[PDB]
Amino acid sequence: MQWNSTAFHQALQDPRVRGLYFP
């Protein structure tokens, strides 16, 4: 299925993944 905002922010719970958006 498509990604969605719930699943996306779940993925960003990982600090390294969140860090991709704040280098």
């Epitope: 498509q2 990604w3 969605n4 905002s5 996306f8 960003l12 991709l20 958006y21």
Partner: antibody, heavy 124, light 109 residues
Framework: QVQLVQSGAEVKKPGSSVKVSCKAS????????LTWVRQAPGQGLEWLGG????????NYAPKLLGRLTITADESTKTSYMELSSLRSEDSAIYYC?????????????????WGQGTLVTVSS | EIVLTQSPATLSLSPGARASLSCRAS??????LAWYQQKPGQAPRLLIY???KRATGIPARFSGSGSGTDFTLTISSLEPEDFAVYYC??????????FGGGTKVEIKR
């Protein structure tokens, strides 16, 4: 000072496909830079899709999933919106828009710069 | 999907009057709401973003307020160039990102 220039009007039969382009005149450009929105005659704005940064993942309006493809050529600073299996209700002005900074809330910023629009008419 | 509902559909106001436009979300969007202006034959233009921040180039008579589900765009004193259609939009819940249905501000004479 960046400007967004879209391709010209299109006229299509039902069941066919259309590919509209949007070229940025300069500035930093990634595949995620440009999102697509449309507006049917006399109606409001409908988001078509965009590209999630980093993952470079296109994300589309559920009602068009399977029919809509958004791509971008970073070497030419051009985004492309391709919509297939066209229906009369796809008749609309199609706009490209630049997504601005998302602040602390990825993946989407706001639509801070717009193309001039491309008219697409679908009719027998 | 988060549905944005705008009210009223049309405002009829004289130049110089205050305009108050409503946008309500079916569930909370925190502050992740923006307002755009659109005139006939033109693309939309961003006015206010994240509920209350004013985009560069936008006059000081435009202000946004609200949080959660209930938002307001206020034009403190209408100029002739302000008669137009206004849309709200949210950037937090997707797919799809959603827009309100628009409010047209037209000239009362």
């Amino acid at each position: 000072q960046v400007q967004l220039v879209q391709s010209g009007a299109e006229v299509k039969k039902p069941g066919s496909s259309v590919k509209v382009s949007c070229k940025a005149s300069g500035g930093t450009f990634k595949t995620y830079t440009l999102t697509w929105v449309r507006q049917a005659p006399g109606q409001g704005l409908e988001w078509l899709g965009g590209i999630i940064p980093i993952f470079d993942a296109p994300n589309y309006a559920p009602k068009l999933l399977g029919r809509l493809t958004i791509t971008a050529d970073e070497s030419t600073k051009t985004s492309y919106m391709e919509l297939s299996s066209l229906r009369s209700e796809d008749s609309a002005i199609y706009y490209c828009a630049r997504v601005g900074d998302y602040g602390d809330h990825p993946p989407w910023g706001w639509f801070d710069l717009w193309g001039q629009g491309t008219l697409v008419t679908v009719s027998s | 999907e988060i549905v944005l509902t705008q009210s009223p559909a049309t405002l009829s106001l004289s130049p110089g009057a205050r305009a108050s436009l409503s946008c309500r979300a079916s569930q909370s969007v925190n502050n992740f709401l923006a307002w755009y202006q659109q005139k006939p034959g033109q693309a939309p233009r961003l006015l206010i973003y994240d509920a209350s921040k004013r985009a560069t180039g936008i006059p000081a008579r435009f202000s946004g307020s609200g949080s959660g589900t209930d938002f307001t765009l206020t034009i403190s004193s209408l100029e002739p160039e302000d008669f137009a259609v206004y849309y709200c939009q949210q950037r937090t819940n997707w797919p799809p990102l959603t827009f309100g249905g628009g409010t047209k501000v037209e000239i009362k004479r």
